[PDB]
Enzyme design. Structure first.
Site, PDB file in Angstrom:
ATOM      1  N   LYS A   1    -136.128 -81.599-102.413  1.00  0.00           N
ATOM      2  CA  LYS A   1    -134.893 -81.062-101.849  1.00  0.00           C
ATOM      3  C   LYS A   1    -134.405 -81.861-100.660  1.00  0.00           C
ATOM      4  O   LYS A   1    -135.194 -82.391 -99.873  1.00  0.00           O
ATOM      5  CB  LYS A   1    -135.099 -79.594-101.452  1.00  0.00           C
ATOM      6  CG  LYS A   1    -135.193 -78.693-102.675  1.00  0.00           C
ATOM      7  CD  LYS A   1    -135.908 -77.363-102.459  1.00  0.00           C
ATOM      8  CE  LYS A   1    -136.339 -76.729-103.786  1.00  0.00           C
ATOM      9  NZ  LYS A   1    -135.240 -76.616-104.808  1.00  0.00           N
TER      10      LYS A   1
ATOM     11  N   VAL B   1    -145.882 -63.642 -78.359  1.00  0.00           N
ATOM     12  CA  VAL B   1    -146.608 -62.438 -78.778  1.00  0.00           C
ATOM     13  C   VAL B   1    -148.013 -62.810 -79.207  1.00  0.00           C
ATOM     14  O   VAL B   1    -148.199 -63.533 -80.158  1.00  0.00           O
ATOM     15  CB  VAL B   1    -145.939 -61.724 -79.970  1.00  0.00           C
ATOM     16  CG1 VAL B   1    -146.817 -60.590 -80.481  1.00  0.00           C
ATOM     17  CG2 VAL B   1    -144.539 -61.235 -79.600  1.00  0.00           C
TER      18      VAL B   1
ATOM     19  N   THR C   1    -138.213 -75.221 -86.413  1.00  0.00           N
ATOM     20  CA  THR C   1    -137.680 -75.648 -87.702  1.00  0.00           C
ATOM     21  C   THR C   1    -136.168 -75.772 -87.653  1.00  0.00           C
ATOM     22  O   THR C   1    -135.558 -76.621 -88.290  1.00  0.00           O
ATOM     23  CB  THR C   1    -138.047 -74.682 -88.833  1.00  0.00           C
ATOM     24  OG1 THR C   1    -139.427 -74.338 -88.763  1.00  0.00           O
ATOM     25  CG2 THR C   1    -137.777 -75.350 -90.165  1.00  0.00           C
TER      26      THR C   1
ATOM     27  N   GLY D   1    -128.888 -79.585 -91.214  1.00  0.00           N
ATOM     28  CA  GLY D   1    -127.729 -78.806 -90.817  1.00  0.00           C
ATOM     29  C   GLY D   1    -126.762 -78.493 -91.922  1.00  0.00           C
ATOM     30  O   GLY D   1    -125.617 -78.183 -91.656  1.00  0.00           O
ATOM     31  N   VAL D   2    -127.188 -78.595 -93.166  1.00  0.00           N
ATOM     32  CA  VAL D   2    -126.243 -78.470 -94.264  1.00  0.00           C
ATOM     33  C   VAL D   2    -126.036 -77.023 -94.672  1.00  0.00           C
ATOM     34  O   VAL D   2    -126.989 -76.255 -94.813  1.00  0.00           O
ATOM     35  CB  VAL D   2    -126.677 -79.307 -95.497  1.00  0.00           C
ATOM     36  CG1 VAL D   2    -125.703 -79.133 -96.654  1.00  0.00           C
ATOM     37  CG2 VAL D   2    -126.750 -80.790 -95.144  1.00  0.00           C
TER      38      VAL D   2
ATOM     39  N   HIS E   1    -125.334 -75.508 -97.759  1.00  0.00           N
ATOM     40  CA  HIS E   1    -125.360 -75.867 -99.169  1.00  0.00           C
ATOM     41  C   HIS E   1    -124.429 -75.022-100.080  1.00  0.00           C
ATOM     42  O   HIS E   1    -124.216 -73.826 -99.874  1.00  0.00           O
ATOM     43  CB  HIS E   1    -126.787 -75.739 -99.684  1.00  0.00           C
ATOM     44  CG  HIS E   1    -127.748 -76.705 -99.072  1.00  0.00           C
ATOM     45  ND1 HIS E   1    -127.820 -78.029 -99.450  1.00  0.00           N
ATOM     46  CD2 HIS E   1    -128.682 -76.539 -98.107  1.00  0.00           C
ATOM     47  CE1 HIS E   1    -128.756 -78.638 -98.743  1.00  0.00           C
ATOM     48  NE2 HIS E   1    -129.301 -77.756 -97.925  1.00  0.00           N
TER      49      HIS E   1
HETATM   50  C1  LIG Z   1    -136.679 -80.965 -93.082  1.00  0.00           C
HETATM   51  C2  LIG Z   1    -135.904 -79.699 -93.312  1.00  0.00           C
HETATM   52  C3  LIG Z   1    -134.587 -79.752 -93.774  1.00  0.00           C
HETATM   53  C4  LIG Z   1    -133.867 -78.583 -93.978  1.00  0.00           C
HETATM   54  N1  LIG Z   1    -132.541 -78.667 -94.363  1.00  0.00           N
HETATM   55  C5  LIG Z   1    -131.771 -77.521 -94.423  1.00  0.00           C
HETATM   56  C6  LIG Z   1    -130.429 -77.614 -94.729  1.00  0.00           C
HETATM   57  O1  LIG Z   1    -129.884 -78.730 -94.783  1.00  0.00           O
HETATM   58  N2  LIG Z   1    -129.715 -76.453 -95.010  1.00  0.00           N
HETATM   59  C7  LIG Z   1    -130.328 -75.240 -94.982  1.00  0.00           C
HETATM   60  O2  LIG Z   1    -129.678 -74.233 -95.249  1.00  0.00           O
HETATM   61  N3  LIG Z   1    -131.645 -75.138 -94.583  1.00  0.00           N
HETATM   62  C8  LIG Z   1    -132.369 -76.269 -94.303  1.00  0.00           C
HETATM   63  N4  LIG Z   1    -133.699 -76.165 -93.949  1.00  0.00           N
HETATM   64  C9  LIG Z   1    -134.264 -74.783 -93.758  1.00  0.00           C
HETATM   65  C10 LIG Z   1    -134.000 -74.289 -92.330  1.00  0.00           C
HETATM   66  O3  LIG Z   1    -134.145 -75.289 -91.355  1.00  0.00           O
HETATM   67  C11 LIG Z   1    -134.945 -73.164 -91.995  1.00  0.00           C
HETATM   68  O4  LIG Z   1    -134.793 -72.224 -93.017  1.00  0.00           O
HETATM   69  C12 LIG Z   1    -134.668 -72.427 -90.697  1.00  0.00           C
HETATM   70  O5  LIG Z   1    -134.465 -73.356 -89.649  1.00  0.00           O
HETATM   71  C13 LIG Z   1    -135.877 -71.548 -90.372  1.00  0.00           C
HETATM   72  O6  LIG Z   1    -135.487 -70.804 -89.262  1.00  0.00           O
HETATM   73  P1  LIG Z   1    -136.468 -69.788 -88.541  1.00  0.00           P
HETATM   74  O7  LIG Z   1    -135.703 -69.159 -87.419  1.00  0.00           O
HETATM   75  O8  LIG Z   1    -137.058 -68.733 -89.445  1.00  0.00           O
HETATM   76  O9  LIG Z   1    -137.728 -70.682 -88.113  1.00  0.00           O
HETATM   77  P2  LIG Z   1    -137.985 -71.475 -86.742  1.00  0.00           P
HETATM   78  O10 LIG Z   1    -136.775 -72.330 -86.447  1.00  0.00           O
HETATM   79  O11 LIG Z   1    -139.256 -72.266 -87.019  1.00  0.00           O
HETATM   80  O12 LIG Z   1    -138.149 -70.407 -85.543  1.00  0.00           O
HETATM   81  C14 LIG Z   1    -139.226 -69.506 -85.442  1.00  0.00           C
HETATM   82  C15 LIG Z   1    -139.462 -69.203 -83.988  1.00  0.00           C
HETATM   83  O13 LIG Z   1    -140.568 -68.333 -83.718  1.00  0.00           O
HETATM   84  C16 LIG Z   1    -141.309 -68.838 -82.589  1.00  0.00           C
HETATM   85  N5  LIG Z   1    -142.613 -68.239 -82.617  1.00  0.00           N
HETATM   86  C17 LIG Z   1    -143.641 -68.429 -83.505  1.00  0.00           C
HETATM   87  N6  LIG Z   1    -144.667 -67.608 -83.145  1.00  0.00           N
HETATM   88  C18 LIG Z   1    -144.273 -66.878 -82.066  1.00  0.00           C
HETATM   89  C19 LIG Z   1    -144.862 -65.891 -81.291  1.00  0.00           C
HETATM   90  N7  LIG Z   1    -146.093 -65.453 -81.489  1.00  0.00           N
HETATM   91  N8  LIG Z   1    -144.168 -65.350 -80.248  1.00  0.00           N
HETATM   92  C20 LIG Z   1    -142.900 -65.770 -79.936  1.00  0.00           C
HETATM   93  N9  LIG Z   1    -142.329 -66.736 -80.698  1.00  0.00           N
HETATM   94  C21 LIG Z   1    -142.989 -67.265 -81.744  1.00  0.00           C
HETATM   95  C22 LIG Z   1    -141.298 -70.357 -82.701  1.00  0.00           C
HETATM   96  O14 LIG Z   1    -141.493 -70.971 -81.459  1.00  0.00           O
HETATM   97  C23 LIG Z   1    -139.853 -70.466 -83.200  1.00  0.00           C
HETATM   98  O15 LIG Z   1    -138.910 -71.218 -82.499  1.00  0.00           O
HETATM   99  C24 LIG Z   1    -134.443 -77.328 -93.709  1.00  0.00           C
HETATM  100  C25 LIG Z   1    -135.778 -77.292 -93.239  1.00  0.00           C
HETATM  101  C26 LIG Z   1    -136.503 -78.471 -93.043  1.00  0.00           C
HETATM  102  C27 LIG Z   1    -137.923 -78.377 -92.571  1.00  0.00           C
END
Ligand SMILES: Cc1cc2nc3c(=O)[nH]c(=O)nc-3n(C[C@H](O)[C@H](O)[C@H](O)COP(=O)(O)OP(=O)(O)OC[C@H]3O[C@@H](n4cnc5c(N)ncnc54)[C@H](O)[C@@H]3O)c2cc1C
Ligand code: NI
Length: 384
Positions: free
Chosen positions: A258, A177, A42, A48-49, A51
Site C-alpha cells: 500500500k 497512562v 504514526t 497525508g493522503v 484516499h
Molecule cells: C507509512 C504510513 C503511511 C500512511 N499513509 C496514509 C495515507 O496516506 N492516508 C491514510 O488515510 N492513512 C495513512 N496511514 C495511516 C495513518 O497514518 C494512521 O492510521 C493514523 O495516523 C493512526 O493514528 P492514531 O491516532 O491512531 O495513531 P498515532 O498517531 O500513533 O497516535 C497514538 C498516540 O497515543 C500515544 N500513546 C501511546 N500510549 C500511550 C499512553 N500509555 N498514554 C498516553 N499516550 C499514549 C502515542 O504517543 C500517540 O501519539 C499511513 C500510515 C503509515 C505508517
C-alpha cells in the site's frame, strides 16, 4: 485526581478527532498524550493522503470507514476547519501485463466501494505519458482516479485538538497512562506517569493509543488483541528542475504494498516511498535506518526516472499498527468491558477514515448525549 466522563488516551489524529467530536456535547472530557506535543507518532509519519477508496478490500472496515470518512472530511470537516490541504488526483501505473490486469481489479474494487464511474479512467501507455510526461516510459498502462486530496496530517490533528480545546475539552500532554483499574462502582481509576496515586476517575475510556492500543486494553484487562507492525521509511527530495507532477503516482499495491508513491507535496517538494519492514518493536516504529535510502532510490527512479534522490532534505519513518487477528481496523467496545472503546489497528487508511471512525467511537459510548446549542465547530489554524 480529576473526575471526568470520558478519558481519551492518545493524541494522534484519532484521539484528536475524537476530542473534536465529543467537544460538541455536554460532557467532562479529557485527552491524554504521553509526548510533550500532539501528533508526534504514526500521524506524523504518513503520506497525508485522503484516499478515494480504490485500494481497500470492499468487505473490510478499512473500505467501509474510508468511504464514510472521506465524505466527512470533504463535506463537513473541510468547511469548518482550516489547515493545509490540496486536491490532487491519484494515478496508479502498471509495468507489464500482470500489473495491467491488477488495474482492472482495482477499477472494480473502486466501483464496489461506490466510486462513481466519472471519477475512474483506465489509460493507455500513450494517454498516461500525455498526462504525466515525467513518468517512466516503460509503463504499459495507468489508472486515474479523481477525488483524492493531500493534507498536512500534523496540522489537521492539531487544528482538531485546538478546536476541541476551545469547546472545553481538557488536553493533558506529557501524560502517559501507566495503569488502569476498573472499580466495583463501574468507573476507572487511571494512574499516569507511574505516580503512586491515580490522576483520573472516569466513566468511559476511549483507547486511541496507536501502537500501544493493545498494551492499553491488556492493561485494563479488557481485551487481548495484539498488533504487529510494518515500518515504512520515506525521503523528501527537492530542486528537481523541470520535473512537474499533477498526480500522486502509485505502484500497484496488490503487488508492491500500500501507498508506494512519488507525490508532489504541499510545500513544493517530492515525497518518495515508503519502504516496508514487518515486525519491528513498538519502540522502534519510527526509527530510520541507513539501509533504506538504497531501496528508496530503486522505488522512486522506477516511477519517475528523472528523479534525483541525492537532493534529499529529510528521511523519516512510521509504522502501520496491524491487528494480528483480522488485519483490519478495530472499532468496537472491548470484548470484556463495554465501557472501554477500542480504536486500534489504525493502519492505512486511518487518516482518511478518521472522522467516521471517531463518530462511531462516540456512539459506542452508548449514551444519550446532549448537545451544546452554541457549539463552536469552526477553527482556522493560523499558518503561513
Ligand atoms: C507509512 C504510513 C503511511 C500512511 N499513509 C496514509 C495515507 O496516506 N492516508 C491514510 O488515510 N492513512 C495513512 N496511514 C495511516 C495513518 O497514518 C494512521 O492510521 C493514523 O495516523 C493512526 O493514528 P492514531 O491516532 O491512531 O495513531 P498515532 O498517531 O500513533 O497516535 C497514538 C498516540 O497515543 C500515544 N500513546 C501511546 N500510549 C500511550 C499512553 N500509555 N498514554 C498516553 N499516550 C499514549 C502515542 O504517543 C500517540 O501519539 C499511513 C500510515 C503509515 C505508517
Ligand atoms: Ni463484495
Amino acid at each position: 485526581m480529576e473526575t471526568r466522563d470520558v478519558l481519551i488516551v492518545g493524541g494522534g489524529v484519532i484521539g484528536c478527532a475524537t476530542a473534536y467530536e465529543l467537544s460538541q456535547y455536554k460532557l467532562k472530557v479529557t485527552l491524554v498524550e504521553k509526548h510533550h506535543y500532539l501528533a508526534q507518532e504514526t500521524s506524523h509519519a504518513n503520506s497525508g493522503v485522503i484516499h478515494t477508496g480504490i485500494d481497500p478490500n470492499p468487505h473490510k472496515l478499512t473500505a467501509k470507514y474510508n468511504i464514510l470518512g472521506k465524505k466527512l472530511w470533504l463535506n463537513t470537516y473541510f468547511k469548518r476547519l482550516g489547515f493545509p490541504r490540496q486536491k490532487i488526483r491519484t494515478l496508479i501505473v502498471a509495468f507489464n501485463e500482470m500489473e495491467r490486469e491488477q488495474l482492472e481489479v482495482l477499477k472494480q474494487r473502486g466501483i464496489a466501494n461506490q466510486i462513481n464511474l466519472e471519477d475512474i479512467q483506465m489509460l493507455s501507455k500513450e494517454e498516461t505519458l500525455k498526462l504525466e510526461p515525467y513518468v517512466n516510459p516503460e509503463i504499459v498502462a495507468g489508472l486515474k482516479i479523481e477525488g483524492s486530496w493531500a493534507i498536512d496530517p500534523v496540522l489537521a490533528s492539531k487544528c482538531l485538538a485546538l478546536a476541541a480545546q476551545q469547546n472545553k475539552v481538557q488536553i493533558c500532554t506529557n501524560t502517559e497512562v501507566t495503569n488502569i483499574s476498573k472499580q466495583v462502582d463501574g468507573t476507572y481509576l487511571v494512574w499516569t506517569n507511574n505516580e503512586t496515586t491515580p490522576s483520573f476517575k472516569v466513566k468511559k475510556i476511549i483507547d486511541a493509543a496507536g501502537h500501544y492500543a493493545d498494551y492499553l486494553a491488556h492493561l485494563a484487562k479488557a481485551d487481548d488483541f495484539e498488533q504487529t507492525t510494518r515500518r515504512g521509511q520515506y525521503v523528501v527530495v527537492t530542486n528537481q528542475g523541470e520535473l512537474h507532477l499533477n498526480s500522486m503516482v502509485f505502484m500497484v499495491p496488490t503487488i508492491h504494498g500500500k501507498g508506494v508513491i512519488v507525490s508532489p507535496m504541499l510545500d513544493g517538494n517530492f515525497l518518495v516511498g515508503p519502504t516496508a519492514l514487518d515486525g519491528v518493536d513498538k519502540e522502534a516504529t519510527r526509527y530510520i535506518t541507513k539501509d533504506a535510502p538504497c531501496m528508496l532510490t530503486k522505488i522512486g527512479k522506477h516511477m519517475v526516472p528523472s528523479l534525483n534522490i541525492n537532493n534529499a532534505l529529510i528521511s523519516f519513518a512510521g509504522s502501520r499498527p496491524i491487528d494480528k487477528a483480522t488485519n483490519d481496523f478495530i472499532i468496537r467496545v472491548a470484548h470484556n468491558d463495554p465501557d472501554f472503546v477500542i480504536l486500534g489497528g489504525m493502519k492505512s487508511p486511518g487518516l482518511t477514515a478518521a472522522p467516521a471512525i471517531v463518530r462511531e467511537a462516540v456512539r459506542l459510548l452508548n449514551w444519550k448525549l446532549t448537545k451544546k446549542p452554541n457549539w463552536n465547530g469552526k477553527y482556522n489554524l493560523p499558518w503561513i
